[PDB]
Design an enzyme around this catalytic site. Structure first.
Site, PDB file in Angstrom:
ATOM      1  CB  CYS A  13      -0.898  -0.035   1.232  1.00 47.04           C
ATOM      2  SG  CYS A  13      -1.998   1.348   1.410  1.00 47.04           S
ATOM      3  CB  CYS A  22       0.481   1.446   4.234  1.00 44.74           C
ATOM      4  SG  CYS A  22      -1.263   1.039   4.569  1.00 44.74           S
TER       5      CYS A  22
END
Ligand SMILES: Nc1ncnc2c1ncn2[C@H]1CC[C@@H](COP(=O)(O)OP(=O)(O)OP(=O)(O)O)O1
Ligand SMILES: [Mg+2]
Lengths: 658, 105
Positions: free
Chosen positions: B30, B33
């Site tokens: 991600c 993230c």
DNA sequence: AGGCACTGGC
DNA sequence: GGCCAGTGCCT
């Protein structure tokens, strides 16, 4: 001759009202339209040709217009109407014996957007032609406030319909001609649009007769049905749905869920740069306080539970186990068929244990789908009369083989297959209680012995002069093969032959395989002889892009390497088509009546076998024997150089008759 | 500096922490993230004593997350004794985070 | 080899 | 839903 067509209120299986019938008598050059009130007259008109000993032409009338009139005749008029095979022609049947290489939409029951090749002219112009009437009606009423109802375009007769009717016939007569014009199947010296049935039939290529008789018989088989044990199968569906439920649980435990990115709109853009890095999972940058977000990207994900059916999950999880995928697909993915699954070897014990549970889970599914949940599932196709009327296309192959479908009853797992004992046992005479005596019928499974190897014998006798022919019968065949090709075990030879992945089948994987064909097609010059003689009559870069079949028909050929099998599959194909035709015929020229209300009934025909239903064990044994003569007959009839045979077996269901 | 939880470690490490643990569910695939990543790292040092920052990957620990209806990442939870104190999904700025925190911390 | 058709994934 | 991909069932 005449060329009629009729418009009813529904498919055969539910038809109950004649709407109209057009006709074009060839001796009058007119199109007499019959309306709902004229039905009786329509029947009279056709019944008239039969008196003349004429010919009636229909498009797919063999499987419909014809048996739908017999139906509607009793229904609507309490009349016994029965057009005899001999006076009927079917442009569909014919158009399947002439345009063998193209492809049809099956009269509008399949989308041609997925069907390869080139679509015919009238074909697409008679099949799709039905929808032309739908919108023509839908529109003319989809504007007058009246909302179109499901399929009300056929509830009631009307002029539009009476029109599309009349046009049907013209396209039909149009077709009919373009077919009779073919000099290969119809001699130019004769004008069949001017002959009597007996002349049309004899004075034309043998295929035209053999196809129609078949098209007519199997259409009878279809209507018969195959007594199917709803109970036994609903019974199995619960046993499986259950065994499934476990394997699932037992697995979902071993292989936990996981997250996967799914739903991102924009593309993650470098913190500095701003490049639309694709490799990275799409995100959603939105707002923002009990706020859920901020203006601050984020990848939206989904929680996904391991699915034994998903060949993806199987590849994922199993790969994280340390599996190194060997065979991949020309699409960038690893082959995960049972084959590789059998081979996979990971280290975690519990896990490799679960590979055998997936293998079985995948199979449990191949059954639950074919029997209960699929679209063409047995349980969905059982009729009110407790029979499954799978459809049969007496051609549609290219070699002569028929094509079964809806549901396909030529792919029922065999008995030598997990649950292939319970499935077969659900298709049987024993599931049909007699009309009067109320007692169960008996099934009679007859099949052609070695029809394959034999078609080779015969064909390679013009070289072997009876070699394999005799070997195959008055001695042994396989050991000669086993010796033919330098092989070890006989059973190996039984595979080597009936399958011509070769080298592998013996041990190696290439050289020894591509060396056996040598020693085999070296110590058996006859098959070598055959092979050569054909290439000679097709290759030169084509001469004749086709072949001639045992009955006369042209049998197109895809490629030079397929040449021999083609020739061989065809020969055994026609051999059977002609066989089941004679068989029934004979069973009639003896005294038995075909039908449920009679003595026997055809329930199924899977290439080289047939499953006839007999009312009494006695009749059952006759059929088994009648099936014999018939075959032998077909032999002399085509001057086969290798005596052909069949092996009978009597029993209650398909399971015990094989 | 920063805590690296595990499915098995989560309970006695965040749940009974008694203090405040801002758990960060994530995954190396991600982008966002990876973005909020250094933010939380410095958040950990500039808050030592008052706040405990614990990261938990959900690719390595697939059991934990599916319990907080995790539907996005980096889903952030500020744990304050057994239950979730506050939830926020996304890459809050080195300043946005210090604002989402303080207003709770 | 010749066919049909089920499930997953987009 | 309509549509390919990857497979497995029969002879
Ligand atoms: N791979 C194959 N593909 C297609 N048909 C096959 C294949 N292998 C065997 N067959 C056919 C051959 C006839 C039928 C039954 O085989 P079976 O082995 O029982 O008879 P057979 O004639 O080979 O030997 P025998 O009757 O002496 O036992 O199946
Ligand atoms: Mg019609």
């Amino acid at each position: 001759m005449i060329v009629s067509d009729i418009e009813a209120n529904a498919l055969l299986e539910s038809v109950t009202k004649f709407h109209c019938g057009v006709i074009y008598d060839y001796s009058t050059a007119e199109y007499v339209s019959y309306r709902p009130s004229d039905f009786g007259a329509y029947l009279d008109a056709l019944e008239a040709e039969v008196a003349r000993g004429g010919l009636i032409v229909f498009h797919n009338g063999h499987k419909y217009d014809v048996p739908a009139l017999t139906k509607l005749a009793k229904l609507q008029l309490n009349r016994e109407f029965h057009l005899p095979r001999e006076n009927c022609i079917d442009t569909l049947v014919l158009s399947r014996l002439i345009h063998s290489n193209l492809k049809d939409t099956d009269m509008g029951l399949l989308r041609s957007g997925k069907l390869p090749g080139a679509l015919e002219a009238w074909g697409y112009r008679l099949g799709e032609m039905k929808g032309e009437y739908k919108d023509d009606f839908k529109r003319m009423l989809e504007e007058q406030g009246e909302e179109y109802v499901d399929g009300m375009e056929w509830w009631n007769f009307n002029e539009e319909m009476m029109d599309y009717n009349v046009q049907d016939v013209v396209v039909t007569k149009a077709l009919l001609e373009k077919l009779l014009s073919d000099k290969h199947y119809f001699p130019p010296e004769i004008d069949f649009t001017d002959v009597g049935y007996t002349t049309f039939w004899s004075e034309s290529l043998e295929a035209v007769d053999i196809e129609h008789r078949a098209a007519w018989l199997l259409a009878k088989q279809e209507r018969n049905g195959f007594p199917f044990d709803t109970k036994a199968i609903e019974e199995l569906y619960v046993e499986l749905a259950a065994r499934r439920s476990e394997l699932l649980r037992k697995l979902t435990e071993t292989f936990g869920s996981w997250y996967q990115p799914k739903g991102g709109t924009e593309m993650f853009c470098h913190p500095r740069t701003g490049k639309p890095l694709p490799k990275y999972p799409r995100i959603k940058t939105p707002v923002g306080d009990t706020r859920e977000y901020v203006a601050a990207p984020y990848t939206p994900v989904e929680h996904v539970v391991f699915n034994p059916s998903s060949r993806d999950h199987i590849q994922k999880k199993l790969q994280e186990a340390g599996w190194v995928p060997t065979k991949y697909t020309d699409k960038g993915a690893p082959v995960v068929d049972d084959e590789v699954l059998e081979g996979v070897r990971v280290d975690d014990p519990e896990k490799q244990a679960a590979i055998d549970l997936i293998k079985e889970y995948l199979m449990i599914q191949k059954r639950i789908g074919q029997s209960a949940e699929g679209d063409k599932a047995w349980l969905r196709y059982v009729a009110e009369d407790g029979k499954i009327h799978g459809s049969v296309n007496p051609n549609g192959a290219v070699t002569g083989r028929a094509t079964h479908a809806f549901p396909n009853l030529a792919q029922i797992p065999g008995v030598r297959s997990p649950y292939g004992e319970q499935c077969r046992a659900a298709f049987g005479a024993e599931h049909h209680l007699d009309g009067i005596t109320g007692k169960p019928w008996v099934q009679a499974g007859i099949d052609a012995s070695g029809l394959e190897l034999r078609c080779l014998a015969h064909f390679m006798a013009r070289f072997d002069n009876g070699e394999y022919a005799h070997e195959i019968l008055n001695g042994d065949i396989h050991t000669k093969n086993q010796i033919a090709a330098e092989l070890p075990t006989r059973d190996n030879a039984k595979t080597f032959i009936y399958g011509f992945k070769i080298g592998q089948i013996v041990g190696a994987g290439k050289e020894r395989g591509k060396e056996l064909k040598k020693k085999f097609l070296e110590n058996t010059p006859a098959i070598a002889a055959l092979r050569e003689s054909i290439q000679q009559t097709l290759v030169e870069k084509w001469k004749r892009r086709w072949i001639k079949g045992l009955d006369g028909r042209k049998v197109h050929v895809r490629s030079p390497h397929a040449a021999l099998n083609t020739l061989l599959q065809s020969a055994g194909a026609l051999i059977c088509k002609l066989w089941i035709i004679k068989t029934e015929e004979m069973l009639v020229e003896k005294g038995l009546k075909h039908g449920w209300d009679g003595d026997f009934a055809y329930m199924a025909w899977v290439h080289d076998e047939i499953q006839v239903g007999c009312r009494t064990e006695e009749i059952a044994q006759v059929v088994i024997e009648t099936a014999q003569e018939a075959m032998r007959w077909v032999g002399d009839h085509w001057n086969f150089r290798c005596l052909l045979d069949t092996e009978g077996k009597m029993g209650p269901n398909w399971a015990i008759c094989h | 500096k920063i805590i690296h939880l595990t499915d098995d470690s989560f309970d006695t490490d965040v749940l009974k922490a008694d203090g405040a643990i801002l758990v960060d569910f994530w995954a190396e695939w991600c982008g966002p993230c990876k973005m909020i990543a250094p933010i939380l790292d410095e958040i950990a040092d500039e808050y030592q004593g008052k706040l405990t920052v614990a990261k938990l990957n959900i690719d390595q620990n697939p059991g934990t997350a599916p319990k907080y209806g995790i539907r996005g990442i980096p889903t952030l939870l500020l744990f304050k004794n057994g239950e979730v104190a506050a939830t926020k999904v996304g890459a809050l700025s080195k300043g946005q985070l210090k604002e989402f925190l303080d207003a709770n911390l």
